[PDB]
Design a binder for these strands. Structure first.
Ligand SMILES: [K+]
Ligand SMILES: [K+]
Ligand SMILES: [K+]
Ligand SMILES: [Mg+2]
Ligand SMILES: [Mg+2]
Ligand SMILES: [Mg+2]
Ligand SMILES: [Mg+2]
Ligand SMILES: [Mg+2]
Ligand SMILES: [Mg+2]
Ligand SMILES: [Mg+2]
Ligand SMILES: [Mg+2]
Ligand SMILES: [Mg+2]
Ligand SMILES: [Mg+2]
Ligand SMILES: [Mg+2]
Ligand SMILES: [Mg+2]
Ligand SMILES: [Mg+2]
Ligand SMILES: [Mg+2]
Ligand SMILES: [Mg+2]
Ligand SMILES: [Mg+2]
Ligand SMILES: [Mg+2]
Ligand SMILES: [Mg+2]
Ligand SMILES: [Mg+2]
Ligand SMILES: [Mg+2]
Ligand SMILES: [Mg+2]
Ligand SMILES: [Mg+2]
Ligand SMILES: [Mg+2]
Ligand SMILES: [Mg+2]
Ligand SMILES: [Mg+2]
Ligand SMILES: [Mg+2]
Ligand SMILES: [Mg+2]
Ligand SMILES: [Mg+2]
Ligand SMILES: [Mg+2]
Ligand SMILES: [Mg+2]
Ligand SMILES: [Mg+2]
Ligand SMILES: [Mg+2]
Ligand SMILES: [Mg+2]
Ligand SMILES: [Mg+2]
Ligand code: NA
Ligand code: NA
Ligand code: NA
Lengths: 64, 180, 349
RNA sequence: GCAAAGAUCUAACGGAGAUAUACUCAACAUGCAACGUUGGAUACUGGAGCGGGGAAGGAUUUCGUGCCAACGGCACUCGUA
RNA sequence: GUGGGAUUGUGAAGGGAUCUCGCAGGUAUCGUGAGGGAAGUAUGGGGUAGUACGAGAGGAACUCCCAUGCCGUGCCUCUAGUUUCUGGGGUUUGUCGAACGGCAAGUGCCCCGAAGCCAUCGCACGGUGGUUCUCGGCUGAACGCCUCUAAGCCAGAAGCCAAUCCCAAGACCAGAUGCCCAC
RNA sequence: UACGUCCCUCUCCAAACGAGAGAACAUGCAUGGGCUGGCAUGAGCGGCAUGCUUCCCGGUGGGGCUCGCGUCCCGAGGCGCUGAACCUUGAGGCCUGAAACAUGCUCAGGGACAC
RNA sequence: UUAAUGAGAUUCCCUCUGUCCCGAGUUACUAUCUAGCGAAACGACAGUCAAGGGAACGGACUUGAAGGGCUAAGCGGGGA
RNA sequence: CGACGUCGCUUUUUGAUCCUUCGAUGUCGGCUCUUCCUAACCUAGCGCCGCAGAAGACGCUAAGGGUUGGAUUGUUCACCCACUGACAGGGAACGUGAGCUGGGUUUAGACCGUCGUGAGACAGGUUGGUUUUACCCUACUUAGCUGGAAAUUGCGAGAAAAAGAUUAUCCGUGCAAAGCGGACGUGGCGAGCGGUGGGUAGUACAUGGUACGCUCAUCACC
């Protein structure tokens, strides 16, 4: 199977890892979100922006 | 030990004979294997040679295949009566999930057992500088690591040690040393 | 670890679809054959006729006869070798083999493990494990011929088992010491209001019979029992890493990797010899020795006859939530770090 | 069984209470455990106090020197003995 | 015979007699298996098939595949739970002159958290032959004919017994074997 | 007499205590290094540069106080050195034997049975 | 009949939860091992079962079936 | 199916009796847990119907395996709502209180109705009302040490063993055959087969550790 990227941190998710979540106000283009760690989901539910967390790919690309 | 190996039964001279008898048998089988592998590896073609890896005692950082470690360890002799060492003790791995109200008293016992084991001494005295360092954050806040100075003295003859604290900024890169 | 594979099962909802299955890894260094034994049938069972020893045995095998090998005289099998080399020893061996050929109906070989080959740091034992392996098929003469040919020689696991077969696993379960009835038998807990504790069995018998029966649950030892574990499917038989470094590389995943995960197996180390990848779980903890046996139940179901082709083998770290398959992948993600920069500067200077 | 009231550690003095050995022997593997005082360290009470004084009740329990048979449900070289 | 001890209670030294005990096994592996225990059990879907049967209404089942419930024995790759690794960080009151380092609040409190343990909250596995009962038959008399019965035979139930699985020589194994000693 | 066994010692697949699996100068133990992972960017210093990053680039703050549009100070927070600092086997993770870890400690083991 | 009041008796709803489905993990003090110290209750004699008869529910009696000796931690069927 | 009659079984109902227990055998129900019976609800086989099919009825062997979640009530019993292949009936001191619980019944406080002049009464209603002890023997669950066949002694001898100068006076094969094939020599000294230890070559095995060819030296058997 193909490897997916985490919704929050863009970590690589290999087959047999992580959890998938379906929000009620789902988006038609992608209805299912993938998370690699429980830490990533907790930050997502707090509505934190990944661009401010220094260990995410979004932060690294801006400051490089 | 068994009756056939007791020092007080065989005697000093008879005991030494057995040790060399085993040593030469081990060495004779050793040197025969070194010569055999040297001939075969040299006679071997390169296609077979690269496949055998470090069987010829050729690979780097790969020990001596012929014998065991501590058989190549050169034994200088009996250490003097008065010696001094500096060593680091990893205290946090000895005190894990112990009761909080007993950590500082337990660290004292572990240090005395640690020093007495490698010094062959039953009388170990804790200097006031080391006792203060262990206790200086309460019963629960024992530091993870400690650097100590061990001195063995003699007054049968009686032996004892005095253990004191060595203040350091960082523990990184420090190994056991013998000081004067 | 776990693997991914495609399913060939007509009529199922997962036909021609990918599934994820957990597997267990067993290291299998070659064994050594040192003995031959024959049995005869009597109205009271099987009786041993005799045993034929090999001319040379190893220190590993001979260590099994001592409690303190390094301080002993080490005299095991010396007189046996001295006698068996002579003329009378040849006569005795011939007589024993003739007795096997004439009066035996079961032939077994005495074999032992190789702990020097298994260069493991956490398995502390150095005296070899010994067992008997029965020889099936053919006539008694053919069995004896095969046993004689396999004497003082190594045997590999692939010569006993094939890839897409099944086996039984004899082993001993993990131990837990003394346990109560709730965890030992699975009885229910009592209400919160119970005086004198609630993790118990309320009634242990009626008035008559006036004694406790053997069918009532009691506290005691739990774990460390022997089990047989039928029908475990073999998913892979892999060669030594010193011979074939690409152990976990498949046709679909071309990444060069071995079977050992990043950081090594927790509490075990590195797999250095041949190995067997079985589907599912087996009884016992890591580092314990177990026995694989050829199946005794019928092998006719579609599940037991299906051929297995692997597509992906997981090699991420088992410490924490591993998210890298290879150290090259981790380096690609992170890039140069402070330690690497310091090392490069020191090397340049 | 001797489990409420958080807790002791260290060195030096004192003491019969020790570093107490038949052979072998360098020391460990053959004298353990425990005590009072002083100096350090670490804690607790937390002013409705294991603070400083009185009534009722007790009547020498107060103080110094000595001593350790019995008593202080473990111990004592200490004690309201 | 040999080697050790010992005799009844009122002082010592020598002898004698008598009595009791020891005089061959020890240590380490691989196996046998009498006897005892004993376990797997149910439902649905596909197809048969809108078929057989039936004026019509209506309406089955076996070989063979695919799943599930209960029970049993394990396991920790994944997911979930648990933290006195007081691991890392944050934060309140007091406190060491301040920063640093911390400390007290019987684990101050909050977030994340490895290893281990663990969930029908996760994953794996759960076999084969005989002997019969009820009953259906074959060959057959008694009894002229007849008749599964009187002699004989066949097929035969989730029953019973054995195999597989667990403990296993007070079941005293003259089962095999390594080494030392005695003869 | 001899082979040997147990205790003291060390390890943990075992474990209430017994019992078990092992080792007997052994990468055995200790400390360090690297890996794998956890948390989330240490103390200190500094603001057009003896600071940081390449081989040319970047360089705050709502307000307030002095002295002469300037120049020095107070200020929660922010930026740089900095995916930094710290922790990582202990009731007990990995590497000294595929390719790409190092040092130190042992210097006649002690005792009892076998008898 | 009654506003206010009640550690009074009763029924329902919201919130909440290990009361339960269905249990799992951790901590202090115990139990457990050691040093010192050290009791009580109770105690005819004792202590493996099946059936029988018997003061109509036996440890002892009749006929059968088991049973080598000594010990550590638990347990609550019997000792009417 | 079966009237009028008639014969039996059971001790899971209530009566009848008063044999045991009053210097005491803890007493209703529920919870938990095990085992037994069959008069068979489901599951396995058969037979027969007034059995076209489907759905059913009435029997026989058979107790191996199953037999549920809730509202009201202290309940047992009962009734209703749902699920299911089915929601069968009973025993074990009316199984089970040093296993729990204490709602009911059944002390002392208090209210009502009826009865009584009254103190008081009521298998009438109501509210509140201490649940003690195991460290002994056995049973059961795990966990250690250890003798012993004349079951501790007698010297009291029995092999699921081999076959011969009475198991001695060789070994192998063969049918407990007919036969066949082998065996170190002359007191020391020679020969052969082997265990170790050196000197040397190559090969095998998973490749540091073992085997094998030649040669030399020792130690054993013959
Ligand atoms: K900083
Ligand atoms: K940073
Ligand atoms: K009655
Ligand atoms: Mg364990
Ligand atoms: Mg209560
Ligand atoms: Mg893990
Ligand atoms: Mg006690
Ligand atoms: Mg206590
Ligand atoms: Mg108490
Ligand atoms: Mg206390
Ligand atoms: Mg002392
Ligand atoms: Mg002091
Ligand atoms: Mg006061
Ligand atoms: Mg006292
Ligand atoms: Mg049986
Ligand atoms: Mg099933
Ligand atoms: Mg988790
Ligand atoms: Mg976890
Ligand atoms: Mg804090
Ligand atoms: Mg503060
Ligand atoms: Mg604190
Ligand atoms: Mg009876
Ligand atoms: Mg009997
Ligand atoms: Mg007991
Ligand atoms: Mg009882
Ligand atoms: Mg009475
Ligand atoms: Mg009575
Ligand atoms: Mg009673
Ligand atoms: Mg009573
Ligand atoms: Mg009754
Ligand atoms: Mg009670
Ligand atoms: Mg009772
Ligand atoms: Mg009540
Ligand atoms: Mg009146
Ligand atoms: Mg009441
Ligand atoms: Mg005898
Ligand atoms: Mg005899
Ligand atoms: Na105050
Ligand atoms: Na006929
Ligand atoms: Na009695």
């Amino acid at each position: 199977m193909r490897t997916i990227e985490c919704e929050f941190s863009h970590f690589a998710v290999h087959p047999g890892h992580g959890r998938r979540y379906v929000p009620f106000a789902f988006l038609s283009t992608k209805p299912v979100l993938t998370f690699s760690r429980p830490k990533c989901f907790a930050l997502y539910m707090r509505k934190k922006n990944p661009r401010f967390i220094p260990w995410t790919r979004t932060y690294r690309r801006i400051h490089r | 030990t068994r009756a056939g190996m007791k020092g007080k039964v065989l005697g000093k001279e008879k005991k030494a004979a057995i040790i060399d008898a085993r040593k030469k048998a081990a060495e004779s089988r050793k040197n025969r294997d070194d010569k055999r592998w040297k001939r075969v590896l040299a006679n071997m073609d390169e296609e077979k040679r690269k496949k055998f890896h470090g069987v010829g005692n050729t690979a780097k950082n790969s020990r001596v295949r012929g014998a065991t470690r501590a058989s190549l360890l050169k034994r200088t002799g009996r250490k003097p009566d008065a010696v001094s060492m500096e060593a680091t003790i990893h205290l946090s791995k000895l005190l894990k999930k112990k009761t909080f109200s007993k950590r500082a008293p337990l660290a004292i016992k572990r240090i005395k057992a640690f020093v007495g084991r490698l010094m062959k001494t039953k009388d170990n005295r804790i200097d006031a500088s080391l006792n203060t360092y262990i206790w200086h954050k309460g019963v629960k806040g024992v530091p993870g690591r400690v650097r100590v100075l061990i001195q063995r003295k003699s007054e049968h003859k009686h032996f004892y040690t005095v253990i004191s604290n060595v203040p350091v900024a960082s523990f990184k890169g420090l190994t056991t040393k013998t000081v004067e | 670890t776990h693997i991914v594979r495609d399913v060939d099962r007509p009529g199922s909802k997962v036909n021609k679809k990918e599934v994820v299955e957990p597997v267990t890894i067993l290291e299998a260094p070659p064994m050594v054959i040192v003995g031959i034994v024959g049995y005869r049938q009597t109205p009271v069972g099987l009786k041993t006729i005799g045993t034929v020893w090999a001319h040379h045995t190893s220190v590993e095998f001979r260590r099994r006869y001592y409690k303190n090998w390094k301080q002993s005289a080490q005299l095991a099998f010396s007189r046996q070798k001295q006698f068996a080399n002579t003329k009378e020893g040849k006569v005795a061996e011939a007589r024993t083999l003739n007795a096997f050929a004439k009066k035996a109906s079961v032939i077994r070989v005495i074999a032992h493990t190789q702990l020097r080959k298994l260069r493991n740091h956490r398995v502390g034992v150095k005296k070899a494990h010994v067992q008997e392996i029965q020889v099936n098929g053919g006539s008694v003469a053919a069995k004896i011929a095969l046993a004689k040919s396999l004497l003082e020689k190594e045997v590999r696991v692939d010569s006993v088992f094939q890839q897409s077969e099944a086996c039984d696993v004899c082993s001993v379960t993990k131990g837990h010491g003394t346990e109560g009835v709730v965890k030992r038998w699975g009885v229910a807990c009592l209400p919160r209001k119970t005086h004198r504790g609630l993790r118990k069995v309320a009634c242990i018998g009626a008035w008559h019979p006036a004694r406790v029966m053997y069918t009532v649950a009691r506290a005691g030892q739990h774990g460390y029992h022997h089990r047989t574990q039928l029908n475990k499917k073999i998913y892979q038989i892999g060669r030594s890493v010193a011979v074939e470094p690409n152990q976990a590389t498949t046709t679909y995943d071309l990444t060069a990797k071995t079977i050992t995960p990043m950081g090594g197996f927790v509490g075990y180390g590195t797999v250095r010899n041949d190995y067997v990848m079985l589907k599912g779980s087996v009884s016992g903890p890591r580092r314990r020795v177990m026995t694989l046996r050829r199946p005794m139940a019928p092998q006719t179901s579609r599940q037991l006859k299906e051929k297995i082709v692997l597509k992906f083998i997981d090699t991420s770290s088992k410490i924490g939530h591993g998210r890298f398959q290879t150290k090259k992948e981790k380096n690609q993600w992170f890039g140069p770090l402070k330690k690497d920069r310091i090392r490069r500067e020191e090397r340049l200077r």
